[PDB]
Amino acid sequence: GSTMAEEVVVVAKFDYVAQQEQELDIKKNERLWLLDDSKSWWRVRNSMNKTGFVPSNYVERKNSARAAANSS
Fold first, then answer.
1. Residue 63: closest CA among 31, 38, 40
2. Architecture of domain 1-72 in CATH?
3. How would you classify residue 29: left for phi > 0, otherwise alpha for psi between -120 and 50, otherwise beta?
4. How far is CA 30 from CA 3, 16, 35, 45, 60, in A?
5. CA–CA gap between residue 33 and residue 62 (Å, rounded)
6. DSSP code of 57?
């Protein structure tokens, strides 16, 4: 079925330092699990079980489909 609201993951292209203590630190080529993507800041999770809000500039949702067809 669908245990817990978590079915979206995004990978980081560059590195970033969670400015605020609430934000989560990222790393170049790091796959972060998106938890809450409703607020301006996209909340993701790290392999360390840690979570925080991060911008959609150093990350990108995965699980895309055919190259030719791009959601349209």
1. 31
2. Roll (2.30)
3. left
4. 24, 11, 15, 11, 10
5. 10
6. T
